[PDB]
Amino acid sequence: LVEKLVAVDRVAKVVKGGRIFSFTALTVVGDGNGRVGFGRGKAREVPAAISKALEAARRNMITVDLAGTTLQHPVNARHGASRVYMQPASEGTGVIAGGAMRAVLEAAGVHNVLAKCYGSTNAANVVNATFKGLRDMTSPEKVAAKRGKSVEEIQ
RNA sequence: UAACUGAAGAGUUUGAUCAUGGCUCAGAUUGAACGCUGGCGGCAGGCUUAACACAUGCAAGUCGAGCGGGGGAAGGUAGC
Ligand SMILES: NCCC[C@H](N)CC(=O)NCCC[C@H](N)CC(=O)NCCC[C@H](N)CC(=O)N[C@@H]1[C@H](O)[C@@H](OC(N)=O)[C@@H](CO)O[C@H]1NC1=N[C@@H]2C(=O)NC[C@@H](O)[C@H]2N1
């Protein structure tokens, strides 16, 4: 189970006589064969935040139906002000995407893809958008099943 | 046989945050210029500004089988 650490930030909370500082971590876990999830963790110190983020990531996971090592069809997704576009690519292309998308795609097992961010590039929002796009991607078998047809009829 | 296959982000407003929005950076390119330095070859390129003013040499001649004159070389004959 591959685990990637997307971002770590230091945050502050004001109290009387000073500020309380903490750390937040965003992590993405995956199996490289169509299962992936992400999570966040907050703690007074970095390792505990990373562990909590990993625990949340393992709790929040989905299954993604890949077409080989690439996507089934072009995907448009958004979460808040972050919009993402993803496109299938031929073998040998690689993962042409930003780091936040790249972690999710590699953990899900995508090897060739072309991706783009529009709008805000906040790491958590971009991860949410990519996660939604991968979750909502469909496949020819599901399309044929829902239309009451055969995959050869669907083409 | 083949003639196309293609899209990455980062920094910076706040005690944290998310958004909006400018500014800045990583690329490719050049008839370039300047600074430091400098061995060779091949192939290209070389006043982007004053269509400002130009010394000097050269860059449009050739035909005597179109024509009449006119020149200067030799030869031969003659004499002394
Ligand atoms: N917001 C705070 C509200 C406070 C407000 N004051 C309330 C109030 O005043 N009156 C009450 C009125 C309530 C209202 N009638 C119900 C309502 O809001 N319906 C709409 C919201 C649906 C649902 N509730 C939220 C939801 O499904 N989120 C998921 C979630 O975050 C996460 O997936 C999971 N599973 O974890 C993520 C992928 O990681 O996908 C998100 N999905 C999405 N992201 C996308 C996005 O942004 N745009 C476009 C589309 O693509 C979106 N879908």
CB-based contacts of A74, cutoff 8 Å, min separation 6:
A85, A86, A87, A88
Break chain A into its structural domains and give their ranges: 2-62, 63-147
Fold of domain A2-62:
Double Stranded RNA Binding Domain (3.30.160)
Assess contact for A101 and A122: CB atoms under 8 A. Answer: no
- What's the token pair of residue A51? 């562990």
Provide φ and ψ at A153, rounded to 5°.
-70, -40
Please report the resolution in angstroms.
2.2
Look at residues A114, A116, A125, A109 and name the one whose alpha carbon lies nearest to residue A90: A114
Assess contact for A114 and A87: CB atoms under 8 A. Answer: yes
Rounded CA-CA distance A155/A36 in Å is 29
Rounded CA-CA distance A77/A87 in Å is 12
Question: CATH for A63-147?
Answer: 3.30.230.10
Extract the runs of DSSP E, i.e. beta strands, from A1-155: 2-15, 18-30, 35-43, 61-63, 75-79, 82-88, 95-96, 113-119
Tell me the technique behind this structure. Answer: cryo-EM
DSSP state of A72: S
CB-based contacts of A138, cutoff 8 Å, min separation 6:
A65, A72, A73
CB A121 under 7 Å to nucleic chain B: yes
Alpha helices in A9-73 (DSSP H): 46-59
Report CA A28 to chain centroid distance, whole Å.
Answer: 7
Look at residues A153, A154, A134 and name the one whose alpha carbon lies nearest to residue A66: A134
Q: Which residues in 2-21 of chain A line strand B, with CB less than 7 A from it?
A: 9, 11-14, 19
- Angle at CA A110, nearest 5°, toward A112 and A31? 155
A9 forms beta bridges with A24
